[PDB]
Motif scaffolding. Sequence first.
Motif: not given
Length: 78
Positions: A1-2, A4, A70-71, A74, A76-78
């Motif tokens: 959250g943010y 990413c 980023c995913v 971990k 981002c927001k997978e």
Amino acid sequence: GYFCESCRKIIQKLEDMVGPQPNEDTVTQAASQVCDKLKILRGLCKKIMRSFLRRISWDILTGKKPQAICVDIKICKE
């Protein structure tokens, strides 16, 4: 959250700086300093690099895209 956004911006400036087909040292220096150079977001980057340094090296060395980095690690927001 943010993160990413942050991570994408961080990695893309690193990718742009180091250029094509880099190596483990040049990525290490270019990234520890990508963060140093990226003002405002400096602390976020320097923390990511401390926490995942040789991962961010693999990431760039495999020329893997930011959304996928980023995913993967971990952030981002997978």
